[PDB]
Design a binder for this molecule. Structure first.
Ligand SMILES: OC[C@H]1O[C@@H](O[C@H]2[C@H](O)[C@H](O)[C@H](O)O[C@@H]2CO)[C@H](O)[C@@H](O)[C@@H]1O
Ligand SMILES: [Cl-]
Length: 410
């Protein structure tokens, strides 16, 4: 017997999500971030809302801008979104794409000159994800060919064929780095859940527009790696860092990554159409969602940030785990039929509106303290694009559309 929120409630939530996406998030990005000096988009916007057109620009950020406007154009049709995606795409191919060695640089100066030429797999993945989405939105052939080329370079220079998975960073000419850390925050270990989750994400979107046989095998191997080595059935959490043989080298827990993975793993297995693997993926997915429900939430329904290596709970609410919880909890409801997950989705949405959203300055606060106080962090930077929250809104709109259809037409 189906337990489903009534039509008024589903439609009201869907409407609020659409309003937030179009009138806050995408409006902010389309108006505040374009740079008419160097083209493209600024690399940073400060806490006061001031853009910085001369700040260094990251590949991940720019791929995220491309992905978000491409996906929004595809789903909503608004011409402004195609215009913004095109703007992101042209700068991306001009400056981030290495025309000689292939793949994308980590960071360029505002004028486009390469600043940090490392080829990090996390950044290569976002390039694939964004380029494939731009192809899905516009049918561009160069974009798809480029996404394919980057896939090839990852497999050639990074795949670990003894152990499964990938070396996570190389230099410009694809010679492996000893230091594959994304940032000073990350453990200096050779394998991370974080990078591998985004490889999976990218490969799934690529497979959508280019269903190559070998890609299906690599995508399947990635799903299997998650089930065997990364997801921990005793705890319902993803292990964060490993050695090359996937021996755990971390005890931290990241609620945001758990709940993001909960829906991304199912998206990937469904893009493949891998019916044999689905039940086990579904089981892991629901477990991740339940563990997040039980351990990662404040009494207001928002998500805490992490439990660190020494056990400390970081109670800060970062913007992106809230976004991922919206999608992951709605997904858990769709999978299980258990309305407690819808209730959790509603609770995090109310938190997003009442605390995470920056009503004064536009967009969403990067971080809000446990007492409700916003931190004066940058509004846009290397690590904060429009992708987590933009995607979360697009996903919720579509998932709610499907739930609304459970009232059969007569
Ligand atoms: O640890 C590296 C940086 O991660 C950033 O958080 C990421 C997160 O790791 C995950 O990949 C998610 O999908 O995107 C998040 C936002 O960019 C974090 O904000 C940075 O502080 C870290 O340096
Ligand atoms: Cl983002």
């Amino acid at each position: 017997t189906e337990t489903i929120p009534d039509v008024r409630r589903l439609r009201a939530l869907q409407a609020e999500v659409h309003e937030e996406l179009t009138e806050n998030i995408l409006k902010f990005w389309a108006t505040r971030t374009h740079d008419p000096v160097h083209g493209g988009f600024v690399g940073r916007v400060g806490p006061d809302g001031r853009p910085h057109p001369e700040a260094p620009r990251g590949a991940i950020l720019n791929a995220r801008i491309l992905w978000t406007f491409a996906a929004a154009y595809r789903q909503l049709g608004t011409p402004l979104y195609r215009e913004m995606a095109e703007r992101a795409y042209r700068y991306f191919v001009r400056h981030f794409v290495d025309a000689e060695h292939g793949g994308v640089y980590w960071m360029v100066a505002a004028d486009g000159r390469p600043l940090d030429t490392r080829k990090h797999v996390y950044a290569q993945s976002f390039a694939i994800y964004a380029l494939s989405e731009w192809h899905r939105a516009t049918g561009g052939e160069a974009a798809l060919a480029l996404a394919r080329s980057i896939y090839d370079l990852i497999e050639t220079h990074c795949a670990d064929r003894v152990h499964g998975g990938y070396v996570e960073a190389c230099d410009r000419a694809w010679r492996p780095l000893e230091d594959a850390r994304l940032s000073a925050k990350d453990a200096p270990e050779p394998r991370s859940m974080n990078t591998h989750l985004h490889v999976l994400e990218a490969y799934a979107n690529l497979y959508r527009v280019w269903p190559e046989t070998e890609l299906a095998a690599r995508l399947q191997a990635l799903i299997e790696l998650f089930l065997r080595a990364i997801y921990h059935p005793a705890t319902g959490h993803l292990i964060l860092f490993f050695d090359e043989r996937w021996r755990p080298r971390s005890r931290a827990v990241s609620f945001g990554h758990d709940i993001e993975a909960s829906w991304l793993l199912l998206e990937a297995v469904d893009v493949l159409g891998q019916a044999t693997l689905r039940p086990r993926v579904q089981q892991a997915s629901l477990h991740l969602a339940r563990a997040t429900l039980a351990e990662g939430r404040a009494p207001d329904g928002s998500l805490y940030y992490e439990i660190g290596e020494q056990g400390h709970l970081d109670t800060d609410r970062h913007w992106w785990p809230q976004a991922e919880a919206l999608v992951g909890f709605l997904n858990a409801y769709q999978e299980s039929g258990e309305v407690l997950f819808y209730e959790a989705a509603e609770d995090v949405w109310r938190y997003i509106r009442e605390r995470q959203r920056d009503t004064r300055g536009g967009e969403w606060f990067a971080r809000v303290r446990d007492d409700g106080a916003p931190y004066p962090d940058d509004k846009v930077d290397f690590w904060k694009g429009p992708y987590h929250n933009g995607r979360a809104c697009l996903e919720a709109i579509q998932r709610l559309r499907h739930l609304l259809e459970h009232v059969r037409s007569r």
